Amino acid sequence: MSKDLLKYLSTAPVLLTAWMSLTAGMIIEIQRFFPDSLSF
Amino acid sequence: AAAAPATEEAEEAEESLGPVGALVGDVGFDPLGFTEILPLAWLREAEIKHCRTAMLATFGFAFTDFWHFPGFDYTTLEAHDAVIAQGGMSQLLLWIGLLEVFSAISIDQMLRGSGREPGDYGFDPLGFASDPAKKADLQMKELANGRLAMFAFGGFVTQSVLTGNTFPYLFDYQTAGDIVAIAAQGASP
Amino acid sequence: AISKPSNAMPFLTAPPCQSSKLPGAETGFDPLYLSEFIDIKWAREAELKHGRICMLATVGYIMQEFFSLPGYPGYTPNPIEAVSSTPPEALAQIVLVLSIIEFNSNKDKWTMDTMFTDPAREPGNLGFDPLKFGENKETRERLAMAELKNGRLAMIAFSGMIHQTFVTGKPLFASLNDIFSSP
Amino acid sequence: MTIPGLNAPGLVPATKKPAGAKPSFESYRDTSHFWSSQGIMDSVPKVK
Amino acid sequence: TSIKPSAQVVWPVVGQEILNGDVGGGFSGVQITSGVFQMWRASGITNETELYWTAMGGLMMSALMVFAGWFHYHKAAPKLEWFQNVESMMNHHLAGLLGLGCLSWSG
Amino acid sequence: ALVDSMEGVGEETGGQIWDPLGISEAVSDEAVMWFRASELKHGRVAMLASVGYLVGAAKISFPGELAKGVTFASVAANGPYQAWDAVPQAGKLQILSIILALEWATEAKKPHYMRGGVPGKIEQLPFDGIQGLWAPKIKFWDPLNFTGALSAEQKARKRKAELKNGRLAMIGIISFITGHNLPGSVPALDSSF
Amino acid sequence: ALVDSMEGVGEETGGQIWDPLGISEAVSDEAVMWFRASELKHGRVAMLASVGYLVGAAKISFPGELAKGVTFASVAANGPYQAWDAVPQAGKLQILSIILALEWATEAKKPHYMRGGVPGKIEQLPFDGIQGLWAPKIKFWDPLNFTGALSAEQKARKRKAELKNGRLAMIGIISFITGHNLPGSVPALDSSF
Ligand code: CLA
Ligand code: CLA
Ligand code: CLA
Ligand code: CLA
Ligand code: CLA
Ligand SMILES: CC(=O)O[C@H]1CC(C)(C)C(=C=C/C(C)=C/C=C/C(C)=C/C=C/C=C(C)/C=C/C=C(\C)C(=O)C[C@@]23O[C@]2(C)C[C@@H](O)CC3(C)C)[C@](C)(O)C1
Numbered sequence: 001m002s003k004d005l006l007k008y009l010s011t012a013p014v015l016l017t018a019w020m021s022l023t024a025g026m027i028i029e030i031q032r033f034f035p036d037s038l039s040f
Numbered sequence: 041a042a043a044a045p046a047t048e049e050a051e052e053a054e055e056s057l058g059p060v061g062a063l064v065g066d067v068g069f070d071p072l073g074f075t076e077i078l079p080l081a082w083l084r085e086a087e088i089k090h091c092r093t094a095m096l097a098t099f100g101f102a103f104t105d106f107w108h109f110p111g112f113d114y115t116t117l118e119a120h121d122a123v124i125a126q127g128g129m130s131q132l133l134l135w136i137g138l139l140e141v142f143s144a145i146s147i148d149q150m151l152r153g154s155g156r157e158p159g160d161y162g163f164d165p166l167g168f169a170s171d172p173a174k175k176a177d178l179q180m181k182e183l184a185n186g187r188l189a190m191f192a193f194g195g196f197v198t199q200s201v202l203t204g205n206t207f208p209y210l211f212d213y214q215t216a217g218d219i220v221a222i223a224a225q226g227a228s229p
Numbered sequence: 230a231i232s233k234p235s236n237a238m239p240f241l242t243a244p245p246c247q248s249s250k251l252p253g254a255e256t257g258f259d260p261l262y263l264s265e266f267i268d269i270k271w272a273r274e275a276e277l278k279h280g281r282i283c284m285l286a287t288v289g290y291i292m293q294e295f296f297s298l299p300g301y302p303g304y305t306p307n308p309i310e311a312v313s314s315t316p317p318e319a320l321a322q323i324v325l326v327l328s329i330i331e332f333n334s335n336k337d338k339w340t341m342d343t344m345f346t347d348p349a350r351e352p353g354n355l356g357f358d359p360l361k362f363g364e365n366k367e368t369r370e371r372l373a374m375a376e377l378k379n380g381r382l383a384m385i386a387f388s389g390m391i392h393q394t395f396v397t398g399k400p401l402f403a404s405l406n407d408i409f410s411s412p
Numbered sequence: 413m414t415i416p417g418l419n420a421p422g423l424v425p426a427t428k429k430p431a432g433a434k435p436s437f438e439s440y441r442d443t444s445h446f447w448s449s450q451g452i453m454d455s456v457p458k459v460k
Numbered sequence: 461t462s463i464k465p466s467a468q469v470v471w472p473v474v475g476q477e478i479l480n481g482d483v484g485g486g487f488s489g490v491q492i493t494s495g496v497f498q499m500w501r502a503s504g505i506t507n508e509t510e511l512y513w514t515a516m517g518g519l520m521m522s523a524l525m526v527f528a529g530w531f532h533y534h535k536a537a538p539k540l541e542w543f544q545n546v547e548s549m550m551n552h553h554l555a556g557l558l559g560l561g562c563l564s565w566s567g
Numbered sequence: 568a569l570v571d572s573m574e575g576v577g578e579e580t581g582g583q584i585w586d587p588l589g590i591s592e593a594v595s596d597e598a599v600m601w602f603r604a605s606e607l608k609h610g611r612v613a614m615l616a617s618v619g620y621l622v623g624a625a626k627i628s629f630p631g632e633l634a635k636g637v638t639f640a641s642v643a644a645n646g647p648y649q650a651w652d653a654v655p656q657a658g659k660l661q662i663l664s665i666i667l668a669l670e671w672a673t674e675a676k677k678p679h680y681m682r683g684g685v686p687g688k689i690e691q692l693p694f695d696g697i698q699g700l701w702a703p704k705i706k707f708w709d710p711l712n713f714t715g716a717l718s719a720e721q722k723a724r725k726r727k728a729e730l731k732n733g734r735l736a737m738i739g740i741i742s743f744i745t746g747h748n749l750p751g752s753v754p755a756l757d758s759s760f
Numbered sequence: 761a762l763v764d765s766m767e768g769v770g771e772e773t774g775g776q777i778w779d780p781l782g783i784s785e786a787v788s789d790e791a792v793m794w795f796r797a798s799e800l801k802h803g804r805v806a807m808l809a810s811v812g813y814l815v816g817a818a819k820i821s822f823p824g825e826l827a828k829g830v831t832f833a834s835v836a837a838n839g840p841y842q843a844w845d846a847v848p849q850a851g852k853l854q855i856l857s858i859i860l861a862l863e864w865a866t867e868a869k870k871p872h873y874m875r876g877g878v879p880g881k882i883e884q885l886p887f888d889g890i891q892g893l894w895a896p897k898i899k900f901w902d903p904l905n906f907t908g909a910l911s912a913e914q915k916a917r918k919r920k921a922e923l924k925n926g927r928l929a930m931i932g933i934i935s936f937i938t939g940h941n942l943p944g945s946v947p948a949l950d951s952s953f
């Protein structure tokens with residue numbers, strides 16, 4: 001790491017890609033553990 | 041001119057090696073010139089890590105050829121896959137990976153130039169080299185042992201697979217015959 | 230030859246938590262340097278809250294295996310199965326009481342930017358000291374260090390208990406007896 | 413379980429094997445992890 | 461002639477395991493129209509170890525190209541007079557790239 | 568301290584430092600304080616081990632019952648080698664727990680022997696001065712003050728004796744175990760070992 | 761050093777430098793030191809080899825047992841050539857291990873015989889001053905101080921005698937081996953050589 005590499009990792013596209021990857025992973029793992037849910 | 045005191049038909053015109061004696065055991069041995077394209081500190085850290093890993097690996101290879109824990113009823117050449125299926129290699133990978141993530145942060149701070157000499161984690165609990173006069177001598181002993189253990193482990197695995205025997209790792213005619221024979225030899229052993 | 234190294238890991242540069250005056254700051258254990266990013270007071274409050282919850286959790290995990298309430302609707306001395314065996318209204322009321330307690334214990338002091346606005350709220354001090362141990366001021370430091378170390382130990386302990394129950398399917402001391410069985 | 417030193421020996425001796433007969437080059441290669449052994453290079457990429 | 465080529469398998473998470481069709485040979489996967497199978501058969505790659513080692517060599521060459529790209533912009537960047545040697549570039553491409561690639565591939 | 572100013576020496580090696588391999592010549596003083604502490608701990612452990620192994624070999628057992636259902640003589644029916652495995656597991660765990668507590672307490676004593684303390688000198692009360700830990704004031708070494716009637720010279724002489732007996736007992740207990748494991752190695756070790 | 765001021769000379773080749781091929785004139789001083797060291801090592805090896813080969817040819821063996829199950833006379837039941845193959849491989853490996861240690865420690869000494877040392881002057885204690893290794897102070901050459909009663913002139917005369925006997929011993933051991941391998945070459949070897 002560095003004081004300026006973390007600033008690059010703090011940019012909008014890198015953070016957007018990382019957060020969308022985390023959200024997609026969380027939803028995919030929820031679908032893996034709790035599949036085919038229509039009602040609550 | 042300053043020729044390299046390990047090849048000496050070639051100079052130390054590999055000036056990426058730096059000043060003479062900056063590292064212990066510096067005999068100017070860089071024929072292929074890896075220091076021209078890579079930093080010296082990172083290469084030194086890789087070298088010392090390889091030295092320590094190969095020392096532990098050589099000792100473990102021989103010890104597993106001799107003794108083992110109860111329940112680990114596996115030979116040395118098949119311990120890898122058997123303990124992977126058992127699950128202990130996952131624990132080894134996890135804990136060694138934690139220590140190596142810490143080492144990664146250490147190398148990142150060292151290459152940016154915090155304070156670190158390569159391979160120095162301060163791990164001297166017994167205080168062998170707390171005397172600064174004996175620091176420079178034990179570094180060379182550590183190096184030479186590590187290099188010899190690298191070669192030793194390579195020979196260990198290659199002769200263990202090639203022949204198929206325990207700790208001597210020798211053929212049948214080298215232990216059940218005569219190697220210092222002076223009679224007229226045949227055409228096979 | 231690091232000029233200012235960490236007290237815990239001497240091969241690393243000193244983390245910003247070492248410069249803080251909080252209890253336990255003498256050891257510089259922060260290899261990932263999360264004290265550089267997270268506020269130290271907020272992280273200390275979170276650490277103390279997790280520690281206290283884990284002390285109560287470890288004690289309850291131990292006591293649930295042996296003892297029981299006198300005729301509870303579904304005991305099942307296995308705390309992973311016990312949370313599904315017990316009525317859900319009990320959990321609803323317990324979580325509601327905890328929600329009330331921590332809604333009122335800091336009336337507007339949620340979030341990182343609003344909690345430690347007053348420079349008199351030290352982290353982890355919710356004012357809960359009825360017996361007035363904290364009016365001594367000689368054993369205040371040793372009690373703070375005892376609370377912090379016991380909280381961290383209880384965190385690690387409760388994680389171990391939970392995952393041991395996961396890998397065994399049995400409570401803690403039954404699994405421990407099966408470890409030290411005979412062969 | 414078998415805790416070493418407590419309800420078990422500390423170090424069980426490994427079974428000793430006599431020395432003989434460099435087997436073949438085509439024997440250990442056809443069961444290795446990278447070269448040949450198409451059922452074992454399919455056994456290297458993880459278990460979990 | 462009866463086994464359909466397939467080199468791409470999907471993960472069953474959401475019901476998408478229906479895409480793992482019956483391509484033949486006791487295998488389930490998505491059918492491949494790239495023609496890489498016939499390209500490998502034209503090279504004599506009948507074993508599945510040689511494909512793995514070709515992949516490893518490709519990874520090594522990709523790392524080599526990454527290092528060369530860093531090296532020629534940050535360490536040893538050629539001057540303008542180097543690029544303008546179009547006769548030398550033309551000779552070297554026409555012989556060493558094309559003719560030697562044809563010669564080595566014919567071998 | 569420096570290896571020259573220690574109490575090892577001895578008339579068996581003539582009155583000089585024995586070290587033939589120069590172990591202390593390649594290491595620091597902080598290493599040789601650890602060496603002295605480890606040597607004295609090894610000597611004391613092996614002195615107790617040699618006496619206990621001789622007692623077990625002579626089939627001398629306590630009159631009574633080790634665990635309810637298990638006699639002392641039932642455990643000591645075989646040799647001392649087949650005696651540690653016949654101890655109940657709870658007893659082995661309690662012995663190891665007591666040794667654990669003793670080692671932790673003796674190491675947590677203040678001036679460590681690698682930072683100013685005397686190597687091999689164990690604190691008299693290892694479980695004293697620890698807050699939230701009350702133990703009686705039984706001394707670990709020398710509870711009944713035998714080494715209070717001795718002067719400095721008698722204490723130095725008996726320390727030299729302790730070092731010599733510790734080394735001899737280390738060789739003896741290794742001889743006992745090796746003679747049991749490999750028959751005919753120690754020829755003085757007849758059958759009952 | 762220079763080939764002129766060396767101790768070979770001898771009255772057999774008149775009293776001048778024998779060298780007919782001009783080896784010593786084409787090479788520098790360092791090669792002459794190497795040649796003298798190799799000549800003296802060759803002569804000493806050949807002297808020991810000649811004495812041992814004559815002892816083996818006379819069927820003289822030690823009273824006892826070489827390996828358990830293998831008598832000295834059982835190995836010596838044939839000629840000296842078919843005795844080296846009857847020695848167990850472990851014993852020959854131990855002999856070569858001692859020889860390897862001696863050669864390594866001899867060459868590891870300082871002022872190498874090219875770089876200042878005397879060629880052929882092997883010092884008395886090759887295993888002295890080595891860290892991590894200890895040996896008694898038995899000298900390699902003259903464990904008994906036989907050449908301490910001699911003067912300088914007697915030492916020079918006996919060095920000349922050593923060189924002459926070394927050359928004769930090389931001729932002799934090569935004659936023995938060639939006579940065994942090619943019978944009828946050396947007529948002085950009846951059958952048992
Ligand atoms: C931090 C502590 C810790 C813990 C809790 C574990 C837990 C485990 N390890 Mg393990 N391991 C660790 C550190 C740890 N590891 C480290 C640092 C290394 C070296 C890098 C390894 C190397 C390793 C290998 C090579 C193997 C394991 C295996 C195992 C499993 C054993 C399963 C079983 O039947 O138990 C067996 C139980 C016993 C034998 C009873 C005695 C064990 C005692 C009670 C442990 C003492 C407490 C322990 C040190 C916790 C720390 C306490 C703290 C105060 C320091 C289990 C998941 C094995 C595995 O995966 O098999 C499934 C295996 O083969 N581990
Ligand atoms: C015989 C010599 C030779 C060869 C083989 C090449 C080959 C190449 N040059 Mg090049 N070049 C040469 C001389 C040569 N040049 C000279 C003398 C000049 C100066 C006048 C230049 C100036 C130049 C510029 C300015 C550029 C190139 C580029 C390229 C690449 C074109 C892309 C392509 O076709 O991908 C084909 C890909 C491959 C064949 C993969 C192999 C890649 C390696 C590096 C090829 C050489 C391998 C080795 C020598 C053979 C070992 C054989 C061994 C296995 C036995 C290609 C790798 C362009 C490029 O892509 O830059 C990176 C580009 O911009 N060259
Ligand atoms: C492991 C136990 C141990 C340890 C730590 C020491 C440590 C020490 N001894 Mg000591 N000693 C021991 C066992 C031990 N001794 C035994 C068993 C004997 C009787 C033979 C002696 C006899 C002895 C004498 C006569 C003297 C010392 C002296 C010293 C001190 C300086 C020498 C030194 O650097 O040693 C460092 C030692 C080690 C690092 C131990 C390495 C052991 C290796 C790993 C194993 C080699 C043993 C080998 C396998 C043979 C085993 C079979 C055995 C039964 C014979 C030092 C404090 C000298 C002293 O105090 O001077 C003031 C001195 O004069 N010792
Ligand atoms: C390999 C053994 C060996 C070596 C290294 C030497 C070395 C030396 N001898 Mg020497 N010598 C030897 C054997 C050896 N000798 C034998 C066996 C005899 C008896 C015939 C002599 C008789 C002898 C005399 C009389 C004198 C020397 C002298 C010298 C020194 C100067 C000559 C020189 O530079 O030649 C260097 C020699 C070599 C590089 C060896 C080359 C050998 C070739 C490669 C093989 C030829 C062998 C040939 C085929 C015969 C083999 C069969 C044989 C059994 C008959 C030099 C230090 C002179 C001296 O000391 O003056 C100061 C001197 O006056 N030597
Ligand atoms: C298991 C493998 C192993 C291990 C752990 C070591 C460990 C060590 N070697 Mg080493 N070495 C090995 C194999 C090994 N070596 C092999 C195969 C070779 C090639 C022959 C070498 C050649 C070598 C050289 C040339 C040197 C070392 C040195 C050292 C020491 C470095 C610093 C030091 O303590 O100096 C301080 C030295 C000591 C404290 C010496 C004490 C060591 C004694 C001999 C222990 C007694 C062991 C005992 C006899 C049991 C062994 C049984 C075995 C013979 C079957 C260190 C203890 C250096 C050194 O200084 O050591 C002399 C050194 O100069 N080694
Ligand atoms: C103040 C002072 O001075 O302190 C004193 C203390 C003290 C005690 C009074 C002293 C003393 C006196 C005494 C009695 C000292 C006694 C020393 C004693 C009795 C030491 C036995 C060694 C036995 C060994 C090494 C066995 C090796 C056995 C070996 C190496 C093997 O056979 C191994 C091997 O078989 C395997 C395992 C497998 C095979 O494939 C390979 C081989 C064959 C190689 C001292 C020394 O004077 C110093």
Ligand SMILES: CC(=O)O[C@H]1CC(C)(C)C(=C=C/C(C)=C/C=C/C(C)=C/C=C/C=C(C)/C=C/C=C(\C)C(=O)C[C@@]23O[C@]2(C)C[C@@H](O)CC3(C)C)[C@](C)(O)C1
Pocket residue numbers: 768769770771772773923924927928931
């Ligand atoms: C101080 C001083 O002066 O030093 C002294 C030292 C010393 C020892 C005292 C001296 C002496 C005296 C002595 C005793 C000198 C002895 C000299 C001696 C006894 C020299 C034998 C040679 C035998 C040979 C060459 C055999 C050839 C063998 C040959 C060429 C073959 O038949 C080989 C061959 O059949 C094969 C193998 C097959 C095919 O390839 C074909 C051929 C045919 C080619 C000196 C000389 O006075 C000098």
